[PDB]
């Protein structure tokens, strides 16, 4: 009943009164409830069709914020409704005005009035935030936004000139990070700009002493992946993820225990969390360098070199430290995510026989440190998380796929992972149980302690004897682990455990059981597990013959 008469004014033919109302609705649309009523009376329709194209720049700044605020307070869909109403054109036209104001030499920007200047920033802030929101909405909106050259060139102009207020600067980087995430066109836009040289400006800033260096790394990493500027195919001046890693690592160097918060702290969301998340993405995306490299002293792999020598030491430090506070509870978590992604990618390499020897010597000692300094301390205090339990087992599984029973036996870790499996009993292959099977299986290969092998082997086989309630994926992993371990009659454990404890009978007994559960899996929902299980029974049959043939 207060807002009803406010809106009438917005359509008033007296520019003074409309422009005032706009002012008030931008505040009033903040509190909930006043916003439900404001949206039902056609606020979005007026603002779009009248207020954003009004002649007065105070009116247009309120218009944009009314949309900004609404976009923020509303659910994600509200943006699609905005997209459909063609807000993007409104934004593009307004964007083209900011640039004309910013890049004009007639009036010209620095010679504007203080209050006049502040208004151009208001409008930019509303624009920036909006673009950010719609790009997050759906893939089509993302590719509609990225299409708009005016929008892009606005972004390059802001990042490049560095005259904008910092809150505007950071929002512009944020935007371009989202726009550039797995988007080829944007990456080409950034690297093809001879007008403002955003790419050069970004490089210089991502490499130097500036406080916002990591922020520029987040943009550049996205560009390097999208354009496949990688170790096999370096970008401009040998550019690839390699050059971002030291900056990203010097960012972890500064975070030390006992200083969570301050009176003035402009770096914490950006400075620390961003660096970790990006290191972990770098971990993920290096996997694509290995695949693409193949279709065509880690000197040839600088990204991998930097990851191991520089990135990983700081991540083991960060994984270790408390944890005094919830915020450092998140630093640990993210540190563990990066270790995880790197360790996993690396373990996606063939190291059997002599294969990839160069990379195996680079990694192996580090893999041992990760296990002793990270995985083991954390495993020492049983309680209490499931989320965290799950994170350490994933990493342990990645590190033990390379270590292969060379992996340290210290706190008898296999027994802990084994107890983890059973107790956490209370996409098939992402089960934590699968993870328990795979790590314990991997550290039990030769040349491990023959009793460590006996336990692990007994657990794996028990799994089959009592397959009555084990999830089919966990059966497949168990069978692969066993084949992986006891398929060599020269290994002490083949005679010392496989034969000594007659593993062969359980395997021969399990064959029928294994055929019915396989056919129990819908090929059509879902394929992978089915075809994977078919290979395990296949291998299971071939495995029961080969030994059958050996005392």
């Amino acid at each position: 009943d207060k807002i009803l008469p406010v809106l009438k004014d917005l359509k008033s033919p007296d520019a003074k009164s409309r422009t005032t109302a706009a002012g008030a609705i931008a505040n009033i649309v903040q509190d909930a409830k006043c916003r439900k009523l404001l949206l039902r009376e056609q606020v979005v329709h007026i603002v779009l069709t009248e207020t954003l194209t009004d002649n007065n720049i105070d009116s247009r700044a309120a218009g944009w914020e009314i949309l900004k605020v609404l976009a923020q307070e509303e659910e994600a869909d509200f943006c699609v409704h905005l997209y459909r109403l063609d807000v993007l054109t409104a934004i593009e036209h307004a964007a083209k005005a900011v640039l004309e104001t910013l890049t004009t030499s007639e009036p010209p920007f620095s010679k504007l009035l203080k209050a006049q200047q502040r208004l151009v920033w208001d409008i930019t802030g509303s624009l920036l935030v909006l673009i950010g929101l719609l790009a997050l909405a759906r893939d089509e909106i993302h590719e509609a936004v990225a299409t708009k050259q005016t929008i892009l060139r606005l972004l390059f102009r802001l990042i490049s000139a560095d005259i904008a207020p910092q809150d505007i600067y950071e929002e512009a980087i944020s935007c371009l990070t989202t726009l550039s995430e797995d988007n080829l066109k944007v990456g080409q836009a950034i690297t093809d700009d001879q007008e403002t040289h955003v790419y050069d400006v970004l490089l210089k800033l991502a490499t130097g002493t500036d406080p916002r260096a990591v922020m520029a790394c987040g943009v550049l990493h996205n560009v390097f992946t999208s354009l496949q500027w990688m170790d096999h195919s370096p970008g401009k001046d040998g550019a690839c993820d390699a050059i971002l890693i030291p900056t990203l690592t010097r960012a972890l160097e500064h975070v030390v225990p006992g200083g969570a918060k301050f009176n003035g702290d402009a770096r914490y969301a950006n400075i620390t969390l961003l660096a970790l998340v990006t290191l972990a993405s770098i971990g993920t995306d290096f996997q694509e360098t290995l695949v693409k490299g193949n279709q065509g002293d880690l000197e040839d792999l600088p990204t991998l070199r930097e990851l191991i020598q520089t990135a990983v030491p700081q991540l083991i430090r960060l994984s270790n430290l408390p944890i005094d506070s919830d915020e450092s509870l998140t630093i640990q978590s993210h540190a563990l995510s990066a270790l995880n992604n790197i360790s996993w990618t690396i373990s996606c390499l063939e190291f059997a026989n002599g294969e990839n020897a160069n990379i195996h010597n680079a990694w192996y000692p580090t893999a041992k440190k990760i296990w002793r300094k990270t995985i083991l301390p954390i495993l020492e205090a049983d309680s209490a998380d499931l989320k965290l339990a799950t994170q350490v087992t994933s990493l342990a599984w990645a590190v033990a796929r390379v270590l292969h029973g060379e992996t340290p036996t210290d706190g008898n870790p296999h027994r802990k992972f084994i107890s983890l499996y059973h107790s956490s009993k209370q996409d098939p292959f992402q089960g934590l149980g699968v993870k328990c099977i795979g790590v314990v299986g991997s550290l039990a290969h030769d040349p491990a302690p023959i009793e460590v092998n006996r336990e692990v082997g007994v657990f794996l086989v028990t799994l089959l004897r009592q397959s009555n309630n084990v999830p089919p994926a966990e059966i497949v992993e168990a069978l692969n682990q066993l084949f992986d371990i006891y398929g060599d009659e020269e290994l002490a454990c083949d005679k010392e455990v496989f034969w000594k404890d007659g593993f062969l009978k359980h395997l021969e007994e399990f064959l029928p059981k294994m055929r019915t559960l396989t056919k129990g899996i819908d090929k059509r929902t879902q394929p992978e597990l089915r075809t994977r299980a078919d290979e395990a029974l296949l291998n299971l049959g071939r495995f029961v013959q080969y030994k059958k043939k050996h005392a």
Partner: peptide, 19 residues
């Protein structure tokens, strides 16, 4: 530039944590 991968590498891309 050729580095031999594991037999079923894509099976393991699920263990990457994304952002």
């Amino acid at each position: 530039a050729f580095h031999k991968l594991v037999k079923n590498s894509a099976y393991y891309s699920r263990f990457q944590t994304k952002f």
